[PDB]
Every structure is written in structure tokens, then in C-alpha cells.
Write a protein that binds this ligand. Sequence first.
Ligand code: HEM
Ligand SMILES: *[C@@H]1O[C@H](CO)[C@@H](O[C@@H]2O[C@H](CO)[C@@H](O)[C@H](O)[C@H]2NC(C)=O)[C@H](O)[C@H]1NC(C)=O
Ligand SMILES: *[C@H]1O[C@H](CO)[C@@H](O)[C@H](O)[C@@H]1O[C@H]1O[C@H](CO)[C@@H](O)[C@H](O)[C@@H]1O
Ligand SMILES: *[C@@H]1O[C@H](CO)[C@@H](O)[C@H](O)[C@H]1NC(C)=O
Ligand SMILES: *[C@@H]1O[C@H](CO)[C@@H](O)[C@H](O)[C@H]1NC(C)=O
Ligand SMILES: *[C@H]1O[C@H](CO)[C@@H](O)[C@H](O)[C@@H]1O
Ligand SMILES: *[C@H]1O[C@H](CO)[C@@H](O)[C@H](O)[C@@H]1O
Ligand SMILES: *[C@H]1O[C@H](CO)[C@@H](O)[C@H](O)[C@@H]1O
Ligand SMILES: *[C@H]1O[C@H](CO)[C@@H](O)[C@H](O)[C@@H]1O
Ligand SMILES: *[C@H]1O[C@H](CO)[C@@H](O)[C@H](O)[C@@H]1O
Ligand SMILES: *[C@H]1O[C@H](CO)[C@@H](O)[C@H](O)[C@@H]1O
Ligand SMILES: *[C@H]1O[C@H](CO)[C@@H](O)[C@H](O)[C@@H]1O
Ligand SMILES: *[C@H]1O[C@H](CO)[C@@H](O)[C@H](O)[C@@H]1O
Ligand SMILES: *[C@H]1O[C@H](CO)[C@@H](O)[C@H](O)[C@@H]1O
Ligand SMILES: *[C@H]1O[C@H](CO)[C@@H](O)[C@H](O)[C@@H]1O
Ligand SMILES: *[C@H]1O[C@H](CO)[C@@H](O)[C@H](O)[C@@H]1O
Ligand SMILES: *[C@H]1O[C@H](CO)[C@@H](O)[C@H](O)[C@@H]1O
Ligand SMILES: [Mn+2]
Length: 299
Amino acid sequence: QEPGSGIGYPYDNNTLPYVAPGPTDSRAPCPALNALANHGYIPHDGRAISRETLQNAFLNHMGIANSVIELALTNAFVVCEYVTGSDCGDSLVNLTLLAEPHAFEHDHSFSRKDYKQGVANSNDFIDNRNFDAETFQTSLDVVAGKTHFDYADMNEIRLQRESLSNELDFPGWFTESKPIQNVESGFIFALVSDFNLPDNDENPLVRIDWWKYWFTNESFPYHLGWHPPSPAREIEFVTSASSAVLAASVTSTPSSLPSGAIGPGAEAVPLSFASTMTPFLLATNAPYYAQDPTLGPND
Ligand code: HEM
Ligand SMILES: *[C@@H]1O[C@H](CO)[C@@H](O[C@@H]2O[C@H](CO)[C@@H](O)[C@H](O)[C@H]2NC(C)=O)[C@H](O)[C@H]1NC(C)=O
Ligand SMILES: *[C@H]1O[C@H](CO)[C@@H](O)[C@H](O)[C@@H]1O[C@H]1O[C@H](CO)[C@@H](O)[C@H](O)[C@@H]1O
Ligand SMILES: *[C@@H]1O[C@H](CO)[C@@H](O)[C@H](O)[C@H]1NC(C)=O
Ligand SMILES: *[C@@H]1O[C@H](CO)[C@@H](O)[C@H](O)[C@H]1NC(C)=O
Ligand SMILES: *[C@H]1O[C@H](CO)[C@@H](O)[C@H](O)[C@@H]1O
Ligand SMILES: *[C@H]1O[C@H](CO)[C@@H](O)[C@H](O)[C@@H]1O
Ligand SMILES: *[C@H]1O[C@H](CO)[C@@H](O)[C@H](O)[C@@H]1O
Ligand SMILES: *[C@H]1O[C@H](CO)[C@@H](O)[C@H](O)[C@@H]1O
Ligand SMILES: *[C@H]1O[C@H](CO)[C@@H](O)[C@H](O)[C@@H]1O
Ligand SMILES: *[C@H]1O[C@H](CO)[C@@H](O)[C@H](O)[C@@H]1O
Ligand SMILES: *[C@H]1O[C@H](CO)[C@@H](O)[C@H](O)[C@@H]1O
Ligand SMILES: *[C@H]1O[C@H](CO)[C@@H](O)[C@H](O)[C@@H]1O
Ligand SMILES: *[C@H]1O[C@H](CO)[C@@H](O)[C@H](O)[C@@H]1O
Ligand SMILES: *[C@H]1O[C@H](CO)[C@@H](O)[C@H](O)[C@@H]1O
Ligand SMILES: *[C@H]1O[C@H](CO)[C@@H](O)[C@H](O)[C@@H]1O
Ligand SMILES: *[C@H]1O[C@H](CO)[C@@H](O)[C@H](O)[C@@H]1O
Ligand SMILES: [Mn+2]
């Protein structure tokens, strides 16, 4: 928000306003990076981004500690090298390349379509990067009529998304990605679980309105009473939430689940790509921004 507004105080004492991305700006498949870039905590154009820039932005403006993004930074830079064909050093070329499919970006996202979702021909591809309201609604629908949800509910959401994706993607495309998605599950609990409940750290419940605001608007739900977690969330919370989601008992099993969908997931590890492998073409669509309604500087 505008620095003088005090909307982040006393959790964030140095806020910057929301500014919608322009048609030439680079945005990511990540609602967190997009919110940061929309506020200029990382470059508004989404280009040439250092590790320390990302670390400071997450820590000071989202209450996410360095430990949480250590692997994410490693993978971002592996993907940058893979896509561009050369070492990216400590300057991530842009956010858009992070939507390289079957890499860091993965199938069965909560709020994005798959790279080959619903395509009539094997060579087609679509926008697997920008926020997709319909896709997100498929996640929200699992928890319809609720204000909060728990680990078991999250497990049902990711299962619904795996089911839909496996049914709708071009035959042969769908590839399950439990370890990456469920880090991101942990991330959701880390950012938008309800810290105003007495047992948040041990039994966190996501506030659905907070989640919806963050994903739809790619800005921070201050107007709904959200603030950056304090103290900043650490990696242990995230991987614990991740394991807890996948350990949760399934009481409604979707059809067309990939094999082994139900049960624990592997620990996330650094990505690696064979030097002979040419990257898939990136979707070229202009960055998404909220239009219903459009956001002001303090939203
Ligand atoms: C340097 C740090 C980060 C990088 C490079 C990164 C990168 C990515 C990428 C490539 C995806 C696309 C995966 C897919 O859904 O197909 C993604 C998704 C996502 N990211 Fe980030 N991320 C970072 C940090 C964070 C943090 C700290 C949070 C929250 C605390 C977060 C929240 C999410 C969520 C919830 C998704 C899933 C979106 C969906 O499934 O619709 N990210 N991230
Ligand atoms: C983000 O960077 C990527 C990587 O350089 C860009 O994707 C490449 O764009 C060039 C044209 O500038 C093409 O020749 C390549 O084919 C693209 N690579 C792939 C794998 O598709 C991308 O255009 C950049 N996006 C933004 C918005 O800046
Ligand atoms: C991105 O741009 C490519 C080259 O300009 C097109 O070949 C792709 O189909 C893709 O087009 C989509 O996104 C752009 C945004 O730049 C629109 O201009 C297109 O109409 C389309 O939505
Ligand atoms: C914001 O400023 C207040 C007042 O000086 C201070 O007490 C608080 O610790 C600050 N918050 C942060 C995160 O630095
Ligand atoms: C997006 O932000 C606007 C402005 O604060 C708000 O009115 C709207 O409800 C938000 N959208 C969601 C889905 O939370
Ligand atoms: C989540 O999982 C990691 C290992 O994957 C642990 O190091 C952490 O303490 C938490 O249990
Ligand atoms: C790991 O940490 C998470 C979040 O604090 C808990 O929910 C889980 O039960 C385990 O202790
Ligand atoms: C990972 O950690 C979770 C959260 O404590 C457990 O529920 C699970 O069994 C796994 O060990
Ligand atoms: C885990 O436990 C649930 C109830 O919480 C059952 O419905 C399910 O069959 C599984 O055993
Ligand atoms: C069984 O119970 C779980 C617990 O959260 C739900 O997620 C599911 O929809 C079913 O009712
Ligand atoms: C139980 O819930 C799952 C996930 O929402 C559905 O796929 C199923 O149809 C049932 O309603
Ligand atoms: C749906 O079915 C799966 C396996 O068929 C169970 O693991 C789950 O508990 C639910 O009953
Ligand atoms: C289907 O395939 C997977 C292999 O990843 C197994 O986990 C599962 O037991 C089933 O055979
Ligand atoms: C989240 O983290 C847990 C613990 O490392 C994994 O088991 C899960 O697959 C996801 O990566
Ligand atoms: C990571 O691992 C892959 C295996 O595919 C190698 O190709 C790559 O060079 C890196 O060592
Ligand atoms: C990258 O480019 C090579 C050759 O140009 C393709 O064969 C490959 O599948 C990928 O698209
Ligand atoms: C988005 O743009 C519209 C222009 O109609 C405004 O109404 C709104 O306040 C926001 O700036
Ligand atoms: Mn995806």
C-alpha cells in the first residue's frame, strides 16, 4: 500500500503501492512472486532479479523467512539456465520463464490451467502461467460454504485438481507432481492460515477469503485483517504442513487419480535438466491483472 497509509504497520513499516502489470511486464506462474512484483518489492517489470532481492522481499513484506525459499531459489536458477541456455548467475532473467512446463511449473496447479489442458492436437499448448478464475473455482468448490479449511481439506483439493488434470490434459501429458505442489500447499498454510486462532502453529486453518484475495488480486489481503506472519514462517512449518496434507485421511476419492496419488510424497529436491534437452516454448500471453474490479494503490 502507499507508504503513508500505515496499512502494513507494525508488521511491515515500509510498504509500496499496488501497480498493475503492463502488457510488456514479465509475470510468473506464482501468485507470491506476482504480488511482490506488483508492489515493486521485486522489479515491477519482472526482470533481472537477484537472490537477495527475493529473500528481502519475502522476509520483509510477506513474513516468509529465507529458509522457506532456499530450494525455490535453487530451482528458479536451474530453470533459468535450462530455458535460456546459459548460467543466469545471480540475475534471474525474468519471471515468465518460471512457467517452463514439467520443470518447476507443474501440472494440476490450484489456479492455473495445464500446458496441454484440453488441447485438440498434440503440439498445441496454452497459457499455463496466468491466474485462471475457472481453474481456481475448481479448487474453491471443494471447500464451498466454508470460511476455513484444514490439512484434510487441502488434501481433497489437490486430489480434485489431480483428477481434473489427468482427465483433461492431452493424452500422455499429465505428470503428477506431489512434492512440488505440496510444498506449495505448505506455503498456503504458511501465508494465509488464521494466526488469530489460539492453536494456529499446531493446527493451522486457511482463511479462504484471504486465499481468494491473494490468488485473484495478486496483492495482499490487508483489508480482510491479514498481515505478514510474525515471527516470519520458517521451512519446518512448511514441510510439516506439506507432510500433514499428504498424511490426512481421504474421505472422498475422485476418479481418474494417477497411480499412488493417495499417500506420502517424496521430499522436494533440486531440479536438473539434461544439457541436450531443449526447453518447451513458453506461453506468450500478456500478464494477468484483476479487472473485476481493478485494484487501487492500497488494495
Ligand atoms: C524464490 C521463491 C519462489 C519461486 C521461484 C516460486 C516459483 C513458483 C512456480 C514456478 C510456481 C508454479 C507451480 C505450478 O503451480 O505449476 C509457483 C506456484 C506457487 N507458489 Fe511460488 N515460488 C516462490 C515462492 C513462493 C512463496 C514464498 C509462496 C508462499 C508463501 C509461494 C506460493 C505459491 C503457491 C501457493 C503456488 C501454487 C499456485 C497454484 O497452484 O495455482 N511461492 N511458485
Ligand atoms: C522471459 O525470458 C524468456 C527466456 O529468454 C523469453 O522466452 C524466449 O523468448 C525469445 C524471444 O525473446 C524466444 O526466441 C524464445 O523461444 C523464448 N524461449 C522459450 C523457451 O519460449 C520470454 O519471452 C521472456 N518473457 C518476458 C515476458 O519477458
Ligand atoms: C503470445 O504471443 C505470440 C507471438 O506474439 C503468439 O503467437 C501466441 O499465440 C501468444 O498470443 C497470445 O497472447 C498475446 C499477448 O501478447 C496476444 O496478443 C494474443 O492475441 C494471444 O492471446
Ligand atoms: C514498525 O515500527 C514500530 C514503531 O517504531 C516498531 O515498534 C516495530 O517493531 C516495527 N516493525 C518492524 C517489523 O520493524
Ligand atoms: C480484490 O481486491 C478488491 C479491492 O480491495 C476487493 O474488493 C475484492 O473483493 C478482492 N477480490 C477477492 C476475490 O478477494
Ligand atoms: C518438514 O520436512 C523436512 C524434511 O523434508 C524437515 O527437515 C522439517 O523439520 C519438517 O519436518
Ligand atoms: C509440523 O508443524 C506443523 C505446523 O506447525 C504442524 O501442523 C504439524 O502437526 C507438525 O507439528
Ligand atoms: C510428515 O510430517 C507430518 C506432520 O507432522 C506427519 O503427519 C507425517 O506422518 C509425516 O511424517
Ligand atoms: C482415514 O480416516 C477417515 C476418517 O477420518 C476414513 O474415512 C478413511 O477411510 C481413512 O481410513
Ligand atoms: C470427508 O472428510 C474430509 C475431512 O476434511 C473432507 O475433506 C471430505 O470432503 C469428506 O467429507
Ligand atoms: C468427495 O470429494 C471429492 C473432492 O472434492 C470429489 O471428487 C468427489 O466427487 C466427492 O464429492
Ligand atoms: C477413497 O478411496 C481411496 C482408495 O480407493 C481411499 O484411500 C480413501 O480413503 C477414500 O475412501
Ligand atoms: C501405479 O504406479 C506408481 C508408480 O509411480 C506406484 O506408486 C503405484 O503403486 C501403482 O503401481
Ligand atoms: C511437502 O514436504 C513434505 C515433507 O518434505 C513432502 O513429503 C511432500 O511431498 C511435499 O514436498
Ligand atoms: C542434474 O541431473 C541431470 C540428470 O538428468 C543431469 O543431466 C544434469 O546435468 C545435472 O547433473
Ligand atoms: C526443443 O527443440 C528441439 C529441436 O529444436 C525439439 O526437438 C525438442 O522437442 C524441444 O521442443
Ligand atoms: C482500476 O481501474 C478502474 C478504471 O475504471 C478504476 O475504477 C479502479 O479504481 C482501478 O483503478
Ligand atoms: Mn502448473
